[PDB]
Symmetry: C3
Subunit: 425 residues, 3 copies
């Protein structure tokens, strides 16, 4: 027997008793595709209005509310909007008197429907609106939601059962060593490679295509707390699932209100009228408390919280040199059931042929070796259907009922609004 | 030396130099019992009423509100209920005029107590209530809570420090190989088995008794996001702990309100009166936003997100063929918890004659030289504890609590009260 | 070859073929410093007042509200406070009539500003306030927040890539065995030690002088350790809060005979109830609060039961495989270290390894691997702060560094605090 340490860096190589070169470092894993992730981005807009508008919507408020921000925020997740009557019509109009602004504004809404909340704000300062011949007319609109910014959306794949692959060249012969397969054939013997433990789970952040790497689950309780993984989750990059912030809490806060000496809490939006430089016009100052107490800057977060390549321990590898030395037909009636890249092992069943043990592959993925006859195995699959099955020789097409990770995420649940009807007696 | 690969499937066996058969595959772990888990199931009921009821409760509203749903939802977690006066009495009655429905309904509540919120809803459409001799009388009741469905409740045990057990038969002799104990004695010489790494933590979902398996923590951010583990947690299968949704937000939403063009958010319940087919009667349409944006279907979720057996790597195993105190321990004391995830303290006196291969109810906790010993061991068995060095056993002294008791240790459960005195 | 099992307890030793003694057990890890953690402690105070106060603040309500609890709760996280007018002035006063208590109390606030919510509570029982010559005058104040108790605050370091270190004395020579480095030289051979797997991630709870307590795992916030401060309030820099935060407490005025009192308040809910005064123009207040997570955490008790004095390791034994297999360069130059330390993101270490062989590179004594002569680039998880002393096993040199601490890393890639925008007039 012989022994030598092999370093893990590019250029690392040993010469005796048989040369072993470190050709590269890669990894194997059982992928769990989480779909799309993004930060919870609280966005707000509105307008200070020297009028009592009759249509509280983006189109109805087009004369005052910024067009593009209104449309974008209106389409956001957990939308909240409030229309406050600061000083209503003293006479005339159409459902515009102060009496139409009862708490909840049902009287105004009866004649002027809106998806927004309507509230009286009498007693709040109307100083922002000036230049009226008689009484001042003033209202305030606020709109907020959690907007999903495309540039802040990342595709995330969780890597489980991670195995560092130490790509070696043993006297010119390729050998890929892992904790699962640490043996290599040498010209006249066997090489057993002592390897460090695997690094545990990895996080693959995909932006578009470039992949960036995290080490861990991630840990939402540590320095990586602002990871999009810890925030908005969309398995199919369309529909939201799981934990969701409450609808934003909108408040009309006058310029001299002592509340302005404090910061808004997460999800809180405070709006303050600004006196107009023009008659019958006014501005609006907005203060919003971001979810998680901070606004995520995606390129900056990725740059500091990820690496260009997956992490691996420093080594070295222990090369143990020894004088020791250790069915090709396709499998039949193979059926694959479950999901792929999902984290739940799929069921692989079929008939292994004669000649010896079938070293079973499913689209080239090693799922184990089986003696001739019926076999059943639970395998974590990384490839989608169709499935080409082999025992190391010719391949055959397996039968499959396999769903994708997004479909798996929606299996066992009934998505959306749950409705019931209470009948009259 | 000799070498051969042994596959890990049933029927796998090698013949030379010494026959080795794969007898089975099992696992060892340090169990962490989480107690009961269930989905957050938002349930809602109510009624559209062409009257101003004087008793806002399930019994008091029995003439309009469905009986069984009211009683069940009333008993739920984080209950919310609202009674809205759409059109009150114009005259007469008993605390039934519009003036009794001030915001918060304190005037109505003085005469007609209720655990529910009471609010005016004047200005909302009263078209659902018709066939009155003079003015219309109308009210709406909504009730919602997080109901725990017994069929949706699962007992969950987290498996940590998992070790795949490769049960071998080496020339008819049983040998259980793991990453911790990879050696088998043979008369030809010692057999060292190269094994793949362990699979990491497992999740055992228990329904009743059958066990189903998950691989991982679980990951609440991936395809298993709807796992009951990610939702309602009751360590003692009675009291709730940790993360809890807010009380449902009940809203009276008229049939033609533009808000109905959007979906309710999680925990939101929108109630809409339905114009009656009969005089002085009306129906109610309810729209509820489930917690997590979807309703969990337990048998279906378990079927797709779990396996019948714990997962293990495919192998093969590397077979390396090489040519290479029994008295019970005394004064043993066990302190802490079992199946909890915090190592218990095991202390005592190892006897003379050699190293004590210490077992606690058959669980290997290590070997100790003669004399005083102290060890921190993750215990899977409950007290009483039988302690042995490999021979005769003795009864240890124990102060060990169960996983539910551990979950409530270091906390004071329930309402916190304080009294501010007059000066 | 020769083989023997070595137990893992203090004193364990084998004599043949080579003496091997178990000297001790320690651990190596890649530290992730999370900063400060504490339970979410909902605290509440208030007063029942037979008057309409004109200054709703701790100082302004000093005649009724307990001084120290008001000041402490006012400084808490997610503060909520409400002032309810139960029975206002019938005449006179200064912005104290019932008409000043419109919903939201904007009319009262015009003359009597406050950071608190102001609401009418007319119709609620005013029985608690008596002894007035004419009409009763009554108001109620409630104040609640999440107070961070210093004695409940713990510094937490997450330990990743954990490696149990089996400290051995092999024929009198120190050998520290791990899953990464399981070989020891024997007088004229080599010892390969078969070791059990590493225990996975650890949690180090740091209190106060300074004492460390240990958890095994992530932790698991869904199991018996659900009340861990790690599952609660997170402050990376022990000053500013980040991530998940409860909503502002929901304050409710609940009369003594309200059927709602037959139920318990939910998490974050605070119910206040006036208590009839034994003295004229005075009243007490009963407060019922629903703690976050359904329970109040008792820190010394939680730590005592949910942690150990030392990190956990498997019981062993170790497999001693004895074999007959046979048993310092110049410092690196132009070395640069970029990223963070004790953060969980590998830092970039680049430089020039000298000629003469492979450089066994150390960064402040931390092993980062071996590199052939010339340019090298590696991603290493660093546990030590800058400055960085770099070596190939001999003399050391000072590396150039742009390395931030764990608290700075926690705030990198985010813009902290209030986000503002201005909507201009058309
Ligand atoms: C289709 C269906 O079951 N709808 C139900 C209805 O039958 C009734 O039970 C009501 C009680 O609130 O809820 C809803
Ligand atoms: C038993 C106890 O301490 N009760 C306290 C009370 O003494 C007082 O401090 C009050 C202040 O809000 O809170 C409550
Ligand atoms: C908002 O959503 C509607 C419906 O999906 C779509 O037609 C419209 O273009 C969207 N607007 C923006 C600005 O995203
Ligand atoms: C090792 O991996 C590389 C890259 O996947 C592959 O080309 C090569 O054939 C592999 N070698 C063996 C022996 O499997
Ligand atoms: C509701 O709870 C009460 C008290 O525990 C019990 O008597 C009653 O049977 C329960 N009703 C339902 C429908 O669960
Ligand atoms: C292996 O495990 C089985 C099942 O627990 C047991 O019956 C058998 O005795 C074990 N063999 C040894 C050598 O411990
Ligand atoms: C409250 O905060 C202020 C400002 O930081 C400080 O001066 C005061 O001492 C604090 N009071 C208490 C009781 O913590
Ligand atoms: C083993 O560890 C101890 C403590 O850290 C150290 O003093 C000793 O030098 C180490 N031995 C070797 C061979 O590295
Ligand atoms: C919920 O309501 C919609 C229409 O609003 C559909 O009728 C749906 O079928 C309803 N579901 C149930 C269970 O009644
Ligand atoms: C909490 O209040 C209850 C009554 O509601 C009991 O009196 C209990 O003893 C209280 N404890 C205190 C004073 O915190
Ligand atoms: C937010 O408002 C503050 C003052 O309240 C500052 O003016 C700050 O620059 C504003 N930010 C933006 C982007 O307008
Ligand atoms: C604030 O938001 C408004 C729209 O709501 C405008 O886009 C304005 O320009 C924003 N402020 C800045 C500085 O970007
Ligand atoms: Na006006
Ligand atoms: Na009426
Ligand atoms: Na009065």
């Amino acid at each position: 027997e012989a022994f030598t340490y092999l370093c893990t860096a590019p250029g690392c190589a040993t010469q005796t008793p048989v040369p072993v070169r470190l050709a590269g470092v890669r990894f194997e894993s059982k992928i769990v595709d989480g779909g799309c992730f993004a930060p919870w981005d609280l966005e707000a807009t509105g307008a200070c209005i020297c009028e009592i508008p009759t249509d509280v919507s983006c189109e109805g408020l087009g004369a005052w509310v910024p067009t593009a921000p209104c449309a974008r925020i209106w389409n956001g997740t957990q939308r909240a909007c409030t229309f406050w009557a600061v000083n209503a019509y003293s006479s005339g109009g159409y459902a515009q008197l102060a009496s139409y602004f009862n708490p909840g504004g049902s009287y105004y809404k009866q004649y002027h429907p809106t998806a927004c909340e309507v509230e009286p704000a009498f007693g709040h300062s109307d100083a922002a609106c000036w230049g009226f011949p008689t009484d001042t007319v003033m209202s305030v609109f606020a709109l907020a939601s959690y907007v999903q910014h495309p540039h802040k959306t990342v595709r995330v794949k969780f890597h489980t059962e991670t195995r560092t692959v130490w790509q070696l060249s043993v006297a010119g012969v390729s050998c890929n060593v892992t904790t699962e397969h640490p043996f290599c054939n040498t010209p006249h013997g066997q090489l057993e490679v002592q390897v460090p433990p695997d690094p545990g789970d990895l996080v693959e952040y995909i932006m578009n295509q470039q992949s960036r790497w995290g080490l861990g689950s991630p840990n939402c309780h540590g320095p990586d707390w602002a990871s999009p993984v810890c925030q908005r989750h969309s398995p199919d990059c369309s529909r939201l699932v799981g934990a969701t912030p409450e609808r934003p809490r909108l408040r009309l806060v006058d310029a001299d209100d002592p509340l302005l000496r404090t910061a808004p809490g997460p999800g809180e939006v405070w709006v303050t009228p600004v006196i107009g430089s023009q008659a019958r016009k006014c501005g609006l100052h907005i203060r919003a408390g971001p979810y998680g107490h901070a606004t995520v800057e995606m390129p900056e977060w990725i740059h500091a919280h990820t690496t260009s390549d997956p992490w691996h321990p420093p080594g070295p590898l222990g090369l143990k040199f020894k004088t020791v030395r250790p069915a090709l037909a396709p499998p039949r009636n193979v059926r694959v059931t479950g999901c792929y890249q999902c984290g739940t092992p799929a069921l692989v069943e079929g008939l292994a042929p004669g000649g010896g043990n079938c070293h079973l592959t499913v689209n080239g993925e090693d799922v184990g070796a089986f003696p001739p006859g019926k076999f059943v195995t639970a395998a974590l699959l990384n490839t989608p259907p169709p499935y080409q099955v082999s025992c190391g020789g010719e391949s055959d097409r397996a039968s499959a009922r396999v769903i994708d990770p997004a479909a798996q995420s929606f299996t066992g649940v009934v998505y959306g609004t749950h409705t019931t009807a209470v009948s009259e007696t």
